[PDB]
Amino acid sequence: AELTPEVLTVPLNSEGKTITLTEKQYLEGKRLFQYACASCHVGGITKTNPSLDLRTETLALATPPRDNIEGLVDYMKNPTTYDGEQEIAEVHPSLRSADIFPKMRNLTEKDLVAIAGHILVEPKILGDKWGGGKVYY
Amino acid sequence: QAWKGHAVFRNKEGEELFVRRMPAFFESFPVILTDKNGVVKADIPFRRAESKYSFE
Amino acid sequence: QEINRRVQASLASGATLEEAWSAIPEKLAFYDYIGNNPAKGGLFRTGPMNKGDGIAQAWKGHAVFRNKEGEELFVRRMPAFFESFPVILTDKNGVVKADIPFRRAESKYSFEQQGVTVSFYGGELNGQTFTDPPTVKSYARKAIFGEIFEFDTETLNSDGIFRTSPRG
Amino acid sequence: QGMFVLPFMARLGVTGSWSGWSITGETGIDPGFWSFEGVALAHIVLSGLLFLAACW
Amino acid sequence: TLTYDDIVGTGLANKCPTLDDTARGAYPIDSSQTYRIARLCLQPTTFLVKEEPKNKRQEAEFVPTKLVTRETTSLDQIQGELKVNSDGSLTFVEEDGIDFQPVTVQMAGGERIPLLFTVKNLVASTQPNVTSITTSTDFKGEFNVPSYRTANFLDPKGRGLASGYDSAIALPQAKEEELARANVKRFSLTKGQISLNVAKVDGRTGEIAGTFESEQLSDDDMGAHEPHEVKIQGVFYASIEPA
Amino acid sequence: ELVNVVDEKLGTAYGEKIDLNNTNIAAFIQYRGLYPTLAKLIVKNAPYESVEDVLNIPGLTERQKQILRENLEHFTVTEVETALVEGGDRYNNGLYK
Numbered sequence: 002a003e004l005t006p007e008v009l010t011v012p013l014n015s016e017g018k019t020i021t022l023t024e025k026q027y028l029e030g031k032r033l034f035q036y037a038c039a040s041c042h043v044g045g046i047t048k049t050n051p052s053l054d055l056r057t058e059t060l061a062l063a064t065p066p067r068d069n070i071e072g073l074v075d076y077m078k079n080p081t082t083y084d085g086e087q088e089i090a091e092v093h094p095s096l097r098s099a100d101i102f103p104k105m106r107n108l109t110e111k112d113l114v115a116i117a118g119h120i121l122v123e124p125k126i127l128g129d130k131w132g133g134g135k136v137y138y
Numbered sequence: 139q140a141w142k143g144h145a146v147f148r149n150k151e152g153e154e155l156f157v158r159r160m161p162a163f164f165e166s167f168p169v170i171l172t173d174k175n176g177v178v179k180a181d182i183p184f185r186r187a188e189s190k191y192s193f194e
Numbered sequence: 195q196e197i198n199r200r201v202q203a204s205l206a207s208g209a210t211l212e213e214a215w216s217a218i219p220e221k222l223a224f225y226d227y228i229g230n231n232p233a234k235g236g237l238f239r240t241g242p243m244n245k246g247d248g249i250a251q252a253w254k255g256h257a258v259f260r261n262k263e264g265e266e267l268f269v270r271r272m273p274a275f276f277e278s279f280p281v282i283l284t285d286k287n288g289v290v291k292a293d294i295p296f297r298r299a300e301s302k303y304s305f306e307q308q309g310v311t312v313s314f315y316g317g318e319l320n321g322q323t324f325t326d327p328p329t330v331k332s333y334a335r336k337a338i339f340g341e342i343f344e345f346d347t348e349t350l351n352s353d354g355i356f357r358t359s360p361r362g
Numbered sequence: 363q364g365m366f367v368l369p370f371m372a373r374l375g376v377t378g379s380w381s382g383w384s385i386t387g388e389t390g391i392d393p394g395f396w397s398f399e400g401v402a403l404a405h406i407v408l409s410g411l412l413f414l415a416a417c418w
Numbered sequence: 419t420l421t422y423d424d425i426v427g428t429g430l431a432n433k434c435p436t437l438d439d440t441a442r443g444a445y446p447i448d449s450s451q452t453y454r455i456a457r458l459c460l461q462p463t464t465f466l467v468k469e470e471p472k473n474k475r476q477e478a479e480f481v482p483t484k485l486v487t488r489e490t491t492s493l494d495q496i497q498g499e500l501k502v503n504s505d506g507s508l509t510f511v512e513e514d515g516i517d518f519q520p521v522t523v524q525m526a527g528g529e530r531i532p533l534l535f536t537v538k539n540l541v542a543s544t545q546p547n548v549t550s551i552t553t554s555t556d557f558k559g560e561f562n563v564p565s566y567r568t569a570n571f572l573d574p575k576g577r578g579l580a581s582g583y584d585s586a587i588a589l590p591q592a593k594e595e596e597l598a599r600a601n602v603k604r605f606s607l608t609k610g611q612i613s614l615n616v617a618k619v620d621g622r623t624g625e626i627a628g629t630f631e632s633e634q635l636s637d638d639d640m641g642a643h644e645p646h647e648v649k650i651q652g653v654f655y656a657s658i659e660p661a
Numbered sequence: 662e663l664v665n666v667v668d669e670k671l672g673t674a675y676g677e678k679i680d681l682n683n684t685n686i687a688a689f690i691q692y693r694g695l696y697p698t699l700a701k702l703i704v705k706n707a708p709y710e711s712v713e714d715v716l717n718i719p720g721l722t723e724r725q726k727q728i729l730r731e732n733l734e735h736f737t738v739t740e741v742e743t744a745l746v747e748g749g750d751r752y753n754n755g756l757y758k
C-alpha cells in the first residue's frame with residue numbers, strides 16, 4: 002500500500018467537490034495536528050470528551066456537517082457543539098480564541114486546511130483505529 | 139434452632155397420654171405411652187400381628 | 195470434522211436433521227469436548243477428570259444456534275490456552291452476529307437483541323428448541339466447550355474445574 | 363460447641379471479646395484488655411518468656 | 419468566619435452547623451409565599467442494626483455497631499422545595515445534593531454491615547396548620563434506597579449486572595443452579611423512613627436544627643444475601659428561605 | 662427465578678432504538694441534531710408514557726420540535742429500569758472509548 006493521490010483525495014464541501022492533497026500537505030497536517038490538537042485528539046478520540054470522536058461518519062452527522070474541509074476549517078475558526086446550538090470557542094481552541102489558546106496564534110488558513118486534511122485522511126488509512134481508542138491500539 | 143413446643147399426646151377417647159422417657163442408659167428405647175397412672179395406652183409395636191396398642 | 199462428515203453423509207442419503215445427528219455415536223461426540231483435552235488441567239488440580247467436570251452421563255445432543263432471521267450461528271470455541279473465554283457467535287463466514295456482552299450499555303449483539311435461539315438434534319434433548327435468552331446463553335456457555343454433556347457432579351463432589359488426563 | 367477452656371475463662375470473669383460480643387449475649391460491651399483474645403495473648407507471651415528463662 | 423484551612427483534617431467538615439441554646443424561636447410561614455430549604459444537613463451519631471432473630475421469634479433488638487469508615491458519613495448541601503399545603507402542613511421535596519454516603523459499621527463478632535445511608539428523593543411532611551416552624555414542629559417522610567452498588571459494579575470473579583461475566587468462569591462445568599443467586603446480579607430498590615424533630619429555631623435567619631432518626635435497609639450485595647435492618651440516629655440542620 | 666434485568670431489557674426495544682426513559686445520553690450522538698441540547702432536555706424530562714410525548718417538553722423551539730419529529734422513528738420507551746437510571750448513569754455510564 003502507498004499514500005496515493007486517491008487516498009489524499011477528500012471532500013472539499015457538502016456539494017460533492019473534492020480536493021487532492023499533496024504528500025507535503027499531509028505531513029504538514031500530521032505535524033500541526035500533533036502540535037495543536039493531539040494533546041486531546043491523539044488517535045482521533047477526545048480525551049476531555051470521549052463521547053465525541055473524529056471519525057468521518059461522526060463528523061458527517063455533526064451540525065453543520067464537518068466531514069469536509071470547509072466544515073473543519075470553520076470548526077477551527079468557530080467551534081460549535083455537535084448540534085450547532087452553542088459556540089464553544091471559549092473552552093475550545095480556535096482562531097477566534099487564539100488569545101486564550103495561544104498555540105492557535107500562528108496558525109494560518111493553509112495550516113487549518115492541512116489539519117482538516119489530516120483529520121479526513123487518517124481514518125482512510127487507519128480505519129477503526131482512528132477514533133477507536135485503546136480497544137483498537 | 140428453636141423449641142418446637144411441648145408435645146401433648148391424646149387418644150381417641152381424649153385421655154392425655156405421656157411418653158415414657160429414655161433413661162441415659164439406653165442408646166435406643168421403645169416408644170411407650172401411659173396414662174397419668176402409668177397404665178399402658180399406646181406404643182409403637184415391634185411385632186404387628188398381635189398389636190393391640192398401636193397409635194392407629 | 196469427522197462428526198460433520200458423518201452428519202453430511204447422513205443428510206445426503208436423505209436423513210432428517212434429527213436422524214442424522216441421532217446416528218452420531220455418543221463416544222465420538224465425547225471426544226469432541228474440551229473437557230477431554232489434556233491441555234486444560236492444573237498442576238494442583240488433583241485426581242481423575244471426573245472430579246472436575248463430573249461423571250459424564252449423556253450427550254445432550256448437538257446444539258444449533260439461530261438468530262431471529264433464522265440464520266445458523268456458530269459459537270467460537272475456546273482454545274486450550276484460555277482458562278476462560280468469551281461467548282461469541284458468528285455466521286458461517288465468521289461475521290459476528292451475537293455475543294454475551296461484558297459492558298451492556300453499548301451492546302449491539304446481545305442474544306436478546308438478536309433473538310438468538312437454540313435447537314438440539316440427537317442426544318437427550320433431540321427435537322427441543324429453547325428461546326428464552328437465559329437458557330440459550332447457558333447452552334452457548336457450554337458450546338464454547340464443544341459438544342455439551344450431562345454430568346453427575348454430586349457423586350464425587352465435583353468442583354467444576356478441568357483436570358488433565360493420565361496422558362497429561 | 364465443644365468449648366473447653368472458654369468455660370474456665372468465663373467462670374472467673376472473662377466474658378467478652380475485643381470484637382464486641384459477650385457470652386451472656388450482650389452487644390457493644392468493652393471488656394478492656396482482658397478479653398478472651400487478651401487472655402490467650404498473655405498466655406502466649408508468658409509461654410515465650412518462660413521459654414527464654416528455661417534457656418538461661 | 420472559618421476558612422477551608424481552618425477546617426481541613428479536623429473532622430468539622432463532617433459536622434452539621436449547630437445553633438446555640440437561645441435559639442428557641444419561631445419562623446413564620448406565609449402561606450402565600452413559596453419556600454425552599456437552601457441546605458439540609460444530616461450528621462449521624464449512632465448506627466444501630468437489627469440483630470437477626472435466633473429463631474425464638476421474639477422481638478429482635480437494634481444493637482450498637484462501630485463505625486469503621488471514619489468521618490465520611492454526613493449528608494449535606496441538600497436542597498429542595500418546601501411546599502405549603504392546603505391544610506397548612508409543610509412538605510419538603512428533595513431535589514438534589516450530596517444525599518447519600520456509603521457507610522460500613524461493624525457488629526459484635528466482626529460482621530461488617532455496609533449500607534447506603536441516604537435521603538434520596540425524600541418526601542417529608544409536617545403536622546397540619548404549621549403557621550410557624552417552632553421547636554414543636556416535626557417532619558416525617560420516606561425516601562428511596564437504591565442498591566448500595568450501582569449497575570457497573572463487578573464482584574471479585576468479574577460478575578456484575580450492567581457489566582461483567584454472567585457465570586462463574588473459574589468453575590466452567592459446575593452445575594449453574596446452585597450458584598444462580600450469585601451469578602445473577604439484581605438491583606435493589608426499597609423504601610426508607612425518617613423523622614426530623616426540630617429542637618432549635620432562629621426565627622430571624624430561617625435556620626432550624628434538631629435530631630433525626632431514620633430507618634432503611636442495608637446493602638444486599640446486589641442480591642447475594644438478605645439485607646439487614648438499620649436505624650440511623652443523629653443531628654440535622656436546615657436553612658429555610660423564601661424563594 | 663432470578664433474572665439479569667439489563668440483559669432482559671436488551672430483548673425489548675431498548676436493544677433496538679434509543680429508549681428515552683433508560684438509554685445513556687451519549688447514544689444521542691448517533692443522529693444529527695440531538696446532542697447535547699435536546700439530549701439534555703430529553704433525559705431531564707423522562708420518563709415518558711409514549712415516544713411522541715417528548716414533543717411536549719417545555720421551552721422547545723420550532724426547529725427542535727421538528728428535529729424531534731424527524732427522529733421519533735429512532736426513539737422508544739420501556740418501563741424505567743432503576744439499574745439503568747440510578748447513580749446518574751444516564752449522564753455517565755462509566756463507558757468511554
Ligand code: CLA
Nearest residue numbers: 236237238239240241242243244245357358359360361362
Ligand atoms: C509416573 C508417575 C505417576 C503418574 C503419572 C501418576 C498419575 C496419576 N495418579 Mg498416581 N501415583 C504415583 C505415580 C504416578 N501417578 C505413585 C508413585 C503413587 C504412590 C504414592 C501414586 C498414587 C496415586 C494415587 C493414590 C492416586 C493416583 C492418581 C493418579 C492420577 C491423578 C494424578 C494427580 O492428581 O497428580 C497430582 C500431582 C501433583 C500434585 C504433583 C506433585 C508434585 C510434587 C509434590 C513436587 C515436589 C517438589 C519437591 C519437594 C521439590 C524439591 C526441591 C529440592 C530439590 C530443592 C493420575 C492419573 C489418583 C487417581 O485418580 O487414581 C484413580 C489417585 O487417587 N496416584
Ligand code: HEM
Nearest residue numbers: 037038041049050053054059060063076077081082083094
Ligand atoms: C486545533 C485544535 C483542535 C481541533 C481542530 C479539534 C477538532 C475537533 C472537532 C472537529 C470536533 C467536533 C467533534 C465532532 O463534531 O464529532 C471537536 C470536538 C471537541 N474537542 Fe477538539 N480539536 C482540537 C483540539 C482540542 C483541544 C486542545 C481540546 C481540549 C483542551 C479539545 C476538546 C474538544 C471537546 C471538549 C469537543 C466537544 C465539545 C462539544 O461538542 O461540546 N479539542 N474537536
Ligand SMILES: CC1=C(/C=C/C(C)=C/C=C/C(C)=C\C=C\C=C(C)\C=C\C=C(C)\C=C\C2=C(C)CCCC2(C)C)C(C)(C)CCC1
Nearest residue numbers: 395396404405407408409410411412413414415416417418
Ligand atoms: C505482676 C503484674 C502481671 C503479672 C506479670 C507476670 C506473671 C510476668 C512474669 C515474669 C516472667 C515470666 C519474665 C520473663 C523472663 C527471663 C528473661 C528477662 C529472659 C532471659 C535469658 C536470657 C538473658 C538467655 C540468653 C541466651 C539464651 C536466649 C540462649 C542461649 C544462650 C543464652 C542463655 C545466653 C499481671 C499480668 C498479672 C497483671 C498485673 C500485675
Ligand SMILES: [Ca+2]
Nearest residue numbers: 347348351352
Ligand atoms: Ca456440589
Ligand SMILES: [Ca+2]
Nearest residue numbers: 553554615616
Ligand atoms: Ca420538637
Ligand SMILES: [Cl-]
Nearest residue numbers: 052053054690
Ligand atoms: Cl461512538
